[PDB]
Symmetry: C5
Subunit: 311 residues, 5 copies
Amino acid sequence: VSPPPPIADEPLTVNTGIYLIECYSLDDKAETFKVNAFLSLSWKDRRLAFDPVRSGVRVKTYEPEAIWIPEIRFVNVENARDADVVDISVSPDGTVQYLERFSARVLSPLDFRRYPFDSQTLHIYLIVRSVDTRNIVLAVDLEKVGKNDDVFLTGWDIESFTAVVKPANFALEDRLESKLDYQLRISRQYFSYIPNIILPMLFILFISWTAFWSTSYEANVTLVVSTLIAHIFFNILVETNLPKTPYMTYTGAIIFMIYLFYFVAVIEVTVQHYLKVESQPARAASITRASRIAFPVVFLLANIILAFLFF
Amino acid sequence: VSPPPPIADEPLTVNTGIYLIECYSLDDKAETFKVNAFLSLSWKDRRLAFDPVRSGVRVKTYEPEAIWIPEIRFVNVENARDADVVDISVSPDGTVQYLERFSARVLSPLDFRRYPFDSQTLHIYLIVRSVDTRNIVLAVDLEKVGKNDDVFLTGWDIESFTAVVKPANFALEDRLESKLDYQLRISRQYFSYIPNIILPMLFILFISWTAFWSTSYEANVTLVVSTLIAHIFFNILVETNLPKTPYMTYTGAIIFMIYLFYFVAVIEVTVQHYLKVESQPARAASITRASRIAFPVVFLLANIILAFLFF
Amino acid sequence: VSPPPPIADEPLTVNTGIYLIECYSLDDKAETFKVNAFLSLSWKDRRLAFDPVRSGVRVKTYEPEAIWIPEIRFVNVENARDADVVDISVSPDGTVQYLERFSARVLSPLDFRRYPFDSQTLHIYLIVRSVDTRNIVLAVDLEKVGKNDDVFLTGWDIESFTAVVKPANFALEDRLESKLDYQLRISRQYFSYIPNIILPMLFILFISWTAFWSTSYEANVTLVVSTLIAHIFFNILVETNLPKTPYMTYTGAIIFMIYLFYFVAVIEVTVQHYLKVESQPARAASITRASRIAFPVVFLLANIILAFLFF
Amino acid sequence: VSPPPPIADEPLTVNTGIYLIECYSLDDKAETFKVNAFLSLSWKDRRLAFDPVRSGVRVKTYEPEAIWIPEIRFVNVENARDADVVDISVSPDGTVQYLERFSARVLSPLDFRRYPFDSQTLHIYLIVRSVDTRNIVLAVDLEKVGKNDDVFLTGWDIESFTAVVKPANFALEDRLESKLDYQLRISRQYFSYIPNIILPMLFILFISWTAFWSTSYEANVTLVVSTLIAHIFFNILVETNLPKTPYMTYTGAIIFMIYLFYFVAVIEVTVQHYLKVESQPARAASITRASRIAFPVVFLLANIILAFLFF
Amino acid sequence: VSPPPPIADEPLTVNTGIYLIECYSLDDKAETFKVNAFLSLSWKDRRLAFDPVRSGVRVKTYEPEAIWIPEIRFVNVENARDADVVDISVSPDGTVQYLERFSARVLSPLDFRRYPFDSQTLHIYLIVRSVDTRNIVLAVDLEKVGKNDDVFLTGWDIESFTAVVKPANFALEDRLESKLDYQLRISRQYFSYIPNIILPMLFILFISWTAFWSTSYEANVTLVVSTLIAHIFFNILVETNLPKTPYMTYTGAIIFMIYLFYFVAVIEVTVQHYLKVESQPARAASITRASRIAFPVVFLLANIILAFLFF
């Protein structure tokens, strides 16, 4: 067993396909997802050709170890995939049809910039390294790229599974390597973030602004500091579900900005009280009266600016 | 070793049965559960037939590798199941009786809409792919579908384990595939949610309403904001036990609605105080007096509406 | 290799023994524990007889694959146990002595009703399924059931490891199955729950009752609501260490009841204040004075009632 | 392949050594640690000797399966160790030198009594069970017990790795078993506990005592209850890092005692207020004045008493 | 199969190369990271040479078991690496080119002193132990050390992957061992720590200082104690992401210092109130007036001092 030799001096073309059976565990923090799929491989091995009329049979079967099979590997996996050879068929002209069912944990970076209203392109990169007697090159048989209808990935919507047809061919340690890019396009179901995080977070913020209709320092200090604490909780909660990025994320920005609002609210609450103690309630009164409008307005303007920058 | 050929031109029928020995780890978040069971397979392989008389035994035993065994696989598993062949028996006319004990982690979506008063239908999908010389088709031998009496699944009640007798047959990459649907019907034991989450959550809400019998702004602000914080804790707790759904869940809705109650309570507490400072306690007095009735009543009406929509 | 045939028409008796070397990870939530032990099997196989004289050796040693070994399996495990055959001895008469060292994760329900003052009976169920040529039946060789002295199971006291000598024999999918029940009796070391949970929880409750010696509504509201929150924390803590049961647990009940005390305390604090504002401190005074006695007394009575119901 | 027979009637001595390459994951809760090391075995097998002069080779090599190797196993591991045979050398007189590299997860109880100022003795117990034709006995070749210089175990200081030279020999299920005790002496680096837990915990306690310089009930109640809550947080934090012991631990005791201080502080705060409302500020005044001294003094005395009892 | 013998009496040189394909899971707490890479080995084995001419081949291929392959192992791994031999080539003069793809979990200490503005040098140590017939020595073929462009390690920037060319040779249990040090230089992306932890932590501290512009003891006590609690939360959060070090870390120091500020603020708040009650507001007034400047100034000075000591 060793590679089938060139008729002329052409590279060996291995036709590939991936057909997703299952998708699970898209782990945002680790930036990985698990996949369970059929991997199909096809290539011409002439040493294996036979006659259809005299052979009586129109297709022949083989056990993995009996014939040469190209070593296809995934680039971005954690560990070598788990594979069960399902079937190997050889037709008269010596065309081999290989089919395996595999499962793997795939590494694939996510762009958290628009979280939780983001979309991602997961990748599964197939690769093959040329042997000494000949160069192996990959291709996509579109007929065999797909996914079953039930493939659901919790908390995500699956848009499409397609392969970039043209391999990237390059040299790696003095041998040719042929690599294919299968893409799984998904978008996050942001729905639940609304009632679980966003609204509660806004509610507590608005509750903080009631201090602008109160002349009680002690009350205000309680309103503002208490809610600020609840905000910290949401901040901590949100940040435990994301990995640490070197860029601001949309939610990250809103969350951060909101601290600025609490800080300024505290200042206002402080100033108002100070003026009152210093026997000048009228300045205090008009600073608070202004704040009742400024706060919601600037909060609204700042958010529009952010949504614009981010979307 | 290769498939037994047709007497006429019929498909090969593989009779299947699953018999649950253990059920554990129904993981709500991941939407998976673990199973440990017997898988039984039966089919006719004539090349194995024999005369009871000349051979002096009514049954014949084999080791897996010695005979053709159909490749049955589960659709919705994470990894290829863990299997020990328990026994392979062949009777005179060449009927094979295969028995394996396996364990697997099964993917199966849950409908969280009525959590925690929900019921689910877990599925185990058996599948087989036709080979080139013939089509394989699955069937359920009801005699061999079951579960032992001790099979308990923590925090769930097991209603039934049955198979949909008629396989779904379809083409997948130009070969016929025969798939069976075994169903495990369970319902969640909602009992503990009552004292651990529901009642405590109601208690803190009712405590908030005592603010309606208090003319102390500072006190009220403390009652309302404090309890609101405890509510956030229950909210966070509850949401860490569920996955993120693109639909409102029953508990989710109650939890969310309750925030609305805290927000409105804060407004009332604010308005009441404001009016009092502005030297009009009588309007304040009657807004509070109304609230004592409105709050509980609207809370009760809103809940009836929800239970109706959800159940 | 296939079962040894009957002298008369008796079943084949396999003598078993389990000798615990290690016990760890009793996981309350998952209801499992890990075990590491010797499994010993003995049975007559006459086909293996030999003459010490004509073979030089008093005992023969065999390698697993060389002889028939009965397929013993555990019922309540997650995955097929991890086994290393330690030794296989055959005495001339053909008695086989088999010794393996295994490790497994065992499923075994716990009764949380008296937590954390509970005791449990863990089970390890050995099983064997009869083959076609003969029935296999299990037995306990008490001489070989035990555990080493150092076997410690963190946070539990080990009472005893014994086997129920009489197998349960029954039919399962048309073959006889012989099952043995090994029992590991343990009791939880409740000690630490005292300083870590119980006492702190009582301290915070008693602290709340100081509100009964205070005429300050604002103070009281703080005492009662604050401690109520700390109670919620202990409640959450406790419930993260237990699985969800369809029955009230002892701690669960105490924890729940205590909420009732906080709720009633809030009412009292509310009533007292209300009356005071309404210019009737004398009724208030005597409601508070009553509460100072009622609360501790009813708390004590209710606890005695519970301990009685639970123990 | 079977044991080498006695020249006289002596037991077979297997010389052992463990050389630590890596130490990691000392998990306090689970009471385990992971080890990666060389295991060396040596024994005389005469059937394997040869001529030094005639052969021209000073030593000779074998593959594991070609010769008898004694079955050495670890007592206190979770699963059978992971082993790669590195090399097997046989010298002229038939002395075999075996060397493997293994990794294992070792169970070994810790004494938490002085946490976090504790020291531990981890154990790795080698064992061998005698065969029928002869008794195997273990010994330590000190020349081959050691650890490399870089072996660092996070958050612990490594004192020494030594073996108790004399095996413990005993009968277990009617065969002799020879067991060796390798000891790894470590001591916890308590440093970080100081700024992360101990000091913060003291700071919050001292902050509570400022209530003794305040005549404001409402303020005090806030100081004392707030800090008590922060104490609960540290308590919870600390207890999540330790397993549950049936004995008080040093930190456990300090933590517990401190609750007593909060409880008594609350009483004092209550009494002081009560007396003040009852128009007797002078008794109140002298109870508070006493408390300013009593609290710190009794806290200091109690701690000295504890350190004495524990150290 | 056994080592190729010396032409003269030279050691056998094994040329090595590591080419990173993937980097993930740098786990700060455990001090490990996962790697997926090509490992290339090359050495001269004369027994394998051939004449290019009477063979009609430039190179020859082999299966692992057919030829001698040096046992290269990693020092600092948890478990023996997962390896797939990709290809083995032998050129005419008997030079072997071996290529495997492996994945492993590597142990490698981190210096947390400047967290989160730290840089680290991860190591992968290749090793080989000499056999009896000859000494094996490692070397780096720089041509084959590298990493692919996409190698991203979440939350870290990858600076470089180089090997220290000169092996460290030493004796270990009476055999020579040759060890190589591959270094992966990374630096932490500190960006997110700014908005998620640092700033929030400063905001709450500054909010505490508003107490210096308030004459309300009750208010102040709330401001100072509340924020102190939020600080504890950030402290706990931060410390759950780091392992426990025997040295102060930069963040650790800032965090600790800040407690000192809260403690002193509480004292000031206490003193101010005390003086006020004692009818001397003017001393109080000037202590508070001083604090408004002292606090921020000393906080700023202390930070400059720390950054200096740490950076």
